Chains A and B, each alone.
With several copies, the nearest count.
Chain A
Amino acid sequence: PQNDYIERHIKQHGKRLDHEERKRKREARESHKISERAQKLTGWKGKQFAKKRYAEKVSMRKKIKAHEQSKVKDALPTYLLDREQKFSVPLPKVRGISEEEMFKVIKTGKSRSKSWKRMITKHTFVGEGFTRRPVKMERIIRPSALRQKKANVTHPELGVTVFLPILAVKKNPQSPMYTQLGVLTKGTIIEVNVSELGMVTAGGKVVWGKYAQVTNEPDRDGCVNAVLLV
């Protein structure tokens, strides 16, 4: 068969003789079936059924509201219309993180008798030109999978988020030791490259570096989120 052969077949032969009646009775039985499913489905399927029922009812209410609203009834230039898009920090206080949580003891030796190496369990920024220290003298371990270079920065102005490279770690509120180790936890002040935002000072200089505050826990969600400090 070719092209719309089922539609042509219906046009040339019709449907089954009980098609309309059977479809009509199925649609009439739908109300009983929906009630039976709501009371009989169990577990995950029941929870999904209730969730979908709530969403459908919300959608119907919005459609009714829009219909009745219809039945009742920035100052951009010409080339931008018809187009779419206190010195307190936002996190003055964050959860305290102890050294027991921050560091993991690494055991060394054949019988695991030595315990002087420590591994940082959080995400870090190691800076440019990082080379690992030789393994015999490496006390602090900052593994490469937990090293970050870029962050999602939200600008309070214009409400946009951009993926910006990290320039430095300015202040980790937990400790200056974590600051100098480059630990990126919630509330850490970082320096970010803001070159693609196109900022200019009052003197005509181009801004390409500013500060931001980390607003999430990268050890929990695998990424760095920060809000720009403006």
Chain B
Amino acid sequence: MQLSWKDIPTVAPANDLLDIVLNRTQRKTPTVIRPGFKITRIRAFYMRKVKYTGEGFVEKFEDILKGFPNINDVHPFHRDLMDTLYEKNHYKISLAAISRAKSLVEQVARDYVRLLKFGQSLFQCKQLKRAALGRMATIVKKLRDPLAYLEQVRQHIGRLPSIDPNTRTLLICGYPNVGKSSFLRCITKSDVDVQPYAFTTKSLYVGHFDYKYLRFQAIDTPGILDRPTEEMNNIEMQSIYAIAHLRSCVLYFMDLSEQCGFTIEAQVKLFHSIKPLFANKSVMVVINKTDIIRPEDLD
């Protein structure tokens, strides 16, 4: 699998894209034509303008469409993660808007080249070329919102950690402030921040280690509250989908000092509630913070 999508070129917004493509035409194609030349020369001048501008827009749109991942063809773990992060409906609608713009720009270029074949003077040929470029500009201006959305998506999706859903994985999960990030820091060299407040970790973090000449990956998750799925939010959806998809050893962390802000009864309730999630996955319960209180001296 591709597993990582940092190699998407920058998406210019609509006005910037218009500047780039139209100025590229004005720079890279000749600009001097005279009304005293042959009509064949004048028509070729304006046809070249229209065709070159159309090709510039088409190449920008193609670079957008080829770079971005195919949400329905990726591994289902990545599909669910990107759906949580970026709202799959908006994702596909924006990319489809880009595709529609590409088709419309190609149609406009073809139509006006065909018309320009019958132009009789510099004035008429120039008017036809201006009409073609203006229609292209109108099409591009209608892409303002999807382009801004896709630029934000590209920047965020380039920084996602690369997770292999078919390798050896240790998943780390539990309530907030139970020691998940601290344990990931202890066993890997990942730089996840450790803080005494809930939801310091707002996205999945990955670390690595070696055991018996094999590379293992460990996943730190944001904490899970004991809520139904209907009122569960996207931050917890990341952990839920990680636990549901990644075949692994799930390590459920428990704090018996209750310095996480949650009682032992609540932590046991959370375990028994997320019990359907780890079926056919290896499961261990790690009681952290034994330097404060030990399971031996419980009530």
Contacts and interface: CB of A to CB of B under 8 A. Distances in A.
Interface extent on B, as a size class?
Answer: 20 to 34
Contact of A3 (B111, B124, B205): B205
A222 to B, nearest CB: 5
Interface in B9-58: 23, 26
B205 A220 contact: no
Interface stretch (B74-82, B114-122, B251-259): B114-122
B191 interface: yes
B206 A2 contact: yes
Contact of B115 (A2, A5, A8, A222): A222
Contact of B114 (A1, A4, A145, A219): A145
A145 B124 contact: no
B122 to A, nearest CB: 12
Contacts of B117: 145
B203 A146 contact: no
Interface residues of A, number: 17
Contacts of A8: 191, 193
Contact of B124 (A1, A2, A4, A219): A219
Interface string A1-21: 111110010000000000000
B26 A44 contact: yes
A145 B115 contact: yes
A4 B26 contact: no
A104 B127 contact: no
Given A2-B160, A8-B193, A44-B26, A222 B131 contact: yes
Contacts of B161: 2-3
Contacts of B202: 3
A143 interface: yes
Contact of A5 (B114, B120, B128, B159): B159
Contacts of B23: 44
B112 interface: yes
A222 B111 contact: yes
A146 B131 contact: no
Interface in A85-132: 104, 121
Interface string B121-154: 0001001100110000000000000000000000
A42 to B, nearest CB: 15
Given A3-B205, A44-B26, A145 B118 contact: yes
Nearest to A48: B19
Given A3-B203, A145-B118, A220 B127 contact: yes
Nearest to B130: A221
Nearest to B114: A145
Given A104-B120, A220-B124, A1 B159 contact: yes
18 contacts: A1-B159, A2-B160, A2-B203, A3-B202, A3-B203, A4-B159, A5-B159, A8-B193, A44-B26, A104-B120, A143-B118, A145-B114, A145-B117, A220-B127, A220-B128, A221-B128, A221-B131, A222-B132
Of all A-B residue pairs in the complex, the 4 with the closest CB atoms, nearest first, are A2-B161, A220-B127, A221-B131, A145-B114
